[PDB]
Each structure stands twice: as C-alpha cells, then as structure tokens.
Amino acid sequence: GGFRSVVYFVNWAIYGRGHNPQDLKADQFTHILYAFANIRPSGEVYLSDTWADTDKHYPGDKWDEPGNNVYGCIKQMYLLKKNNRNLKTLLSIGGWTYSPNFKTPASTEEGRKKFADTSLKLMKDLGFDGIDIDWQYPEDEKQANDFVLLLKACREALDAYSAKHPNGKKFLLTIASPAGPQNYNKLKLAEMDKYLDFWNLMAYDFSGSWDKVSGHMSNVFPSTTKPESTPFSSDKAVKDYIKAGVPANKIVLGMPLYGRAFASTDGIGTSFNGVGGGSWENGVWDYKDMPQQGAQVTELEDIAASYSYDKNKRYLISYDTVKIAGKKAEYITKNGMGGGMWWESSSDKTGNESLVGTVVNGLGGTGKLEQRENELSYPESVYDNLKNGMPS
C-alpha cells in the first residue's frame, strides 16, 4: 500500500518544550500517536493530564460555549484531522513510565474487557482513529499470552463499534514493538499480527547510560570491523519479524529525533563514564540542538549510523543526521517496509534539515504516502463541540 509516516506527540511537550499540536507540519504525517494514557489496576484506561489533554484553552477556544465541551490538545488534534483528511490520530496507552501497570489488568478476562471498553470509550469521545498500546515490555510468556488476549479484546471492541456505524470508518489498533531479541523472542508475533493494523518497531535506544561501552543507538546493520560498537541492529529485528510471519509492509521503522550522549570516552565502542548534560534531561539531546559547537560529525553510511564527538571534552553523541535518515529511507523502500515512525515531534529541525522531511522525500514524497481517509464523525461523543465537528 503507500508508505506510512507516524509521529509521537507527547502531551508533556506543551510545557518546558513549548511545542503545541499547532506546530506540527500536518501534511508530512499519516498518523499521530498521542502519548500517553495511563492504566488503572481495574484495567480502566484514563488520560494522564487533563490540563494538557482537555482543559487548557488555546486562542480560538471560547469560554462561554453551550454544552459540555473539550479543549486542550485533543481539540487541536481534531482540528488537524478536519484540515487534513489523510491525517489519522491514535490514543497511545502505556509507554516506559506507565508499563508496570499492564500486568495486573492484563492477567484477567475482567481486566482485559475493562481495558477494551474504557479505551474504546476514550477513542469515540475524543475523536481518535484508533489506539496504540505500548507495553514495554511483556516480561515472560504468560504476560506475552495475556498481551495477545488484550489485543483480541481491543480489536473486538473496535469492530463492534464500527458495526454500530456501518457507513463510518474502520478503526486502527497498533502497538510499539521491541527491537531487542530478548524482548521480541518471547512474544507471539504471528498471533498478535492478526489483530494489528501495523507494528511501530522501536528501532532505537540500542545503547545508553545503562551500558558500560559507548554504542550506536539506532543503527540499521551490525558492524563487522567494530562489533562492540553495535550491540544491536534494526536489520536483525526486521529479519526476525519477517521470519516469524510478520509482513514487511506492516512494519514501521521507528527512528530517534534525539541523541544519547557518552562522556569521558575515547570514541564509539569504548568505555565511558557518565553522560554529561542534555537538552531537557542529562544524557539526552534533541536533534534540533545538534551539532554542538566544537563537536565533529562522523557518518558511517554503510551501517547507517552517525555520531558527533568532541575530542577536547571526549564527549560522544549518537544521533542521526540527514544523510543517515536518507539511508534509513533507502532501507524502508528496498525492503518494502510499512514506513517510518519517529519519537518525537518536538525535537526535529524544520526546513531542509528535518529528518522527517528527509525520510518522506526519500520515500518518494507525500504522494507515496498511504491514502486512507480519517474519521470526522463521532456521534456518540459526550462532547458537544466535537460531535458537531468543532464548528465553534
């Protein structure tokens, strides 16, 4: 089908980062994942920040509107949908901080239905085209099995809702998936695939502060000359997924819009101590703050990896440049993969230095993106302004 362009919009971005949904170049994406909803012990899914999500008024949002109305970033996401009919939005549930919360609701049938019903409720009230589940990660086979059951329960609730509105759209079920063999090898990949529209493979965080040696954090291919610099590779993951029965065109390659740093290092693949500063938190740098003054950039086109290194501070930052992004685009194209996904929208550069723009153009452009109309009708929404299509 065409290629997908998937981005994570993080709801805490509206604070210190100053990134609002209005700043998204909507025409370069097919799918926005709104992160992150949290999970109650009952299985009930709920919004993590009602201020950012529903309450904050933006310019254009009236104070005096009749009826029960939604504002926040949810309204802004619907506005984007109205204006770009090829743009779909999904409610992303879980993520790193919240993943502890999956195990208990997921272990029972009651828990699983509460999850499914409450997530569907959120979807149809807030105007989303589907839900994305990011359990990072199922610790073992039991959990992996429960996760398959969780997916089934959600897929049934979705379909049941579509059945209630035969002429309306179908809805999406998506997940973020592991690139590390020790995590994906315990999942029942072929089983899960039956329920999903597509797989956003988290092909990044291959290295970080948790290691003892500086490594490439999102490279495609392993290094034969320096194996220590590539603990992982996305190619290993993609190939294993396909062997397990997952179709290449349903796998979306996750790409970092940030870099991880290593301090007091002689270079890639050597020991390091500490991670230095960061754009917002230590050890992590936004792509848009790169390159750092005094750092030299090295591009390993063959393994598709890049990093900066400042000889004087002995500081290493593993992150992708435009060159390397075009190389990952190459890879998506060559292997007929489902598209590109990025974490996350606040940190890309604009214009010709944008990693997202580089990949979309390397995919043949916006015309080669999957064309699938989003859903604007939400007749069962509790929110007046949304079910009326945000007339205002």
Side-chain angles (χ1 to χ4, degrees):
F3 289 117
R4 284 178 266 237
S5 183
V6 189
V7 77
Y8 275 97
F9 179 85
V10 119
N11 66 179
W12 59 89
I14 70 147
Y15 296 113
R17 287 174 175 88
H19 179 61
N20 303 99
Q22 296 75 334
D23 308 324
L24 269 9
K25 284 96 196 67
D27 62 281
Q28 65 183 355
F29 304 113
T30 50
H31 293 268
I32 297 167
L33 307 186
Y34 191 77
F36 275 116
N38 194 13
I39 316 114
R40 227 112 226 184
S42 58
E44 176 187 283
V45 174
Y46 66 110
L47 297 170
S48 54
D49 179 348
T50 53
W51 180 251
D53 296 338
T54 56
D55 295 353
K56 181 199 177 70
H57 284 53
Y58 275 103
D61 301 347
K62 289 159 169 165
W63 301 102
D64 65 343
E65 283 196 84
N68 179 54
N69 295 295
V70 251
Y71 295 108
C73 290
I74 295 298
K75 176 173 176 181
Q76 294 303 127
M77 286 306 177
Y78 190 80
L79 291 187
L80 288 195
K81 304 231 306 190
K82 281 176 71 172
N83 204 77
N84 174 13
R85 299 306 323 273
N86 200 40
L87 183 60
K88 283 71 64 180
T89 56
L90 283 80
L91 212 222
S92 185
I93 305 163
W96 196 238
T97 311
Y98 298 159
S99 282
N101 297 342
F102 278 113
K103 75 182 203 312
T104 309
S107 63
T108 66
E109 198 153 45
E110 301 60 60
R112 290 178 213 126
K113 284 307 152 307
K114 211 89 215 290
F115 187 99
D117 285 352
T118 61
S119 59
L120 183 283
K121 189 215 69 256
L122 247 23
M123 194 205 83
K124 58 95 192 182
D125 283 328
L126 302 166
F128 290 97
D129 298 286
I131 58 172
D132 169 60
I133 305 168
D134 303 349
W135 183 343
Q136 302 181 45
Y137 296 93
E139 303 181 78
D140 61 12
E141 287 279 283
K142 191 236 193 274
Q143 286 185 18
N145 271 281
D146 294 348
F147 192 18
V148 184
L149 276 14
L150 189 65
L151 258 35
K152 177 165 200 291
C154 292
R155 184 63 283 171
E156 294 180 336
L158 255 40
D159 295 351
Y161 179 76
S162 275
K164 280 281 177 202
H165 297 95
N167 280 84
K169 301 302 200 298
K170 301 295 171 58
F171 295 100
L172 298 300
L173 180 61
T174 277
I175 57 159
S177 53
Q182 302 310 75
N183 292 142
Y184 60 68
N185 283 319
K186 62 186 66 179
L187 293 163
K188 274 103 183 294
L189 298 187
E191 250 313 306
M192 288 156 85
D193 189 61
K194 308 165 163 190
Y195 304 118
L196 284 344
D197 287 90
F198 58 90
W199 296 72
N200 292 307
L201 179 70
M202 289 179 309
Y204 39 79
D205 285 355
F206 296 160
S207 43
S209 60
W210 49 93
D211 290 311
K212 313 282 165 45
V213 155
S214 55
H216 284 122
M217 93 98 144
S218 66
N219 56 294
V220 186
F221 303 103
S223 172
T224 309
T225 50
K226 192 181 293 188
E228 44 280 3
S229 71
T230 48
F232 298 91
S233 66
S234 63
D235 184 51
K236 178 68 68 296
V238 178
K239 282 187 172 163
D240 274 1
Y241 270 64
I242 286 173
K243 277 210 184 68
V246 182
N249 64 206
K250 288 182 72 179
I251 309 172
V252 179
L253 207 255
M255 295 179 273
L257 282 181
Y258 61 92
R260 287 190 184 264
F262 302 96
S264 305
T265 335
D266 286 343
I268 206 75
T270 54
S271 21
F272 66 97
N273 192 328
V275 298
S279 304
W280 300 102
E281 60 170 354
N282 297 74
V284 186
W285 293 99
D286 287 1
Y287 169 67
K288 61 177 183 183
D289 293 338
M290 300 292 92
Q292 290 196 349
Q293 270 131 345
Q296 61 94 236
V297 179
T298 293
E299 290 167 319
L300 305 273
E301 55 328 284
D302 65 324
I303 62 171
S306 44
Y307 60 87
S308 58
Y309 184 71
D310 185 313
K311 181 107 56 217
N312 300 315
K313 312 180 192 172
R314 302 208 300 125
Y315 194 63
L316 181 332
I317 307 174
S318 174
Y319 74 96
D320 291 340
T321 61
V322 297
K323 189 87 92 304
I324 297 297
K327 275 304 191 188
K328 296 189 169 183
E330 275 182 31
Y331 186 85
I332 294 176
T333 264
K334 271 191 168 184
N335 296 275
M337 288 188 75
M341 172 282 267
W342 304 257
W343 174 277
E344 40 72 39
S345 67
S346 61
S347 45
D348 191 19
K349 294 186 192 193
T350 291
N352 284 74
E353 285 287 330
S354 161
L355 301 186
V356 180
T358 296
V359 177
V360 172
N361 287 331
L363 257 35
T366 45
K368 287 301 186 176
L369 297 189
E370 173 189 71
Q371 300 301 313
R372 187 242 178 87
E373 190 171 85
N374 66 26
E375 179 61 89
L376 300 184
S377 175
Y378 288 84
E380 285 183 56
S381 178
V382 138
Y383 297 115
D384 286 292
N385 67 333
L386 191 128
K387 62 187 176 187
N388 276 105
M390 294 306 178
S392 303

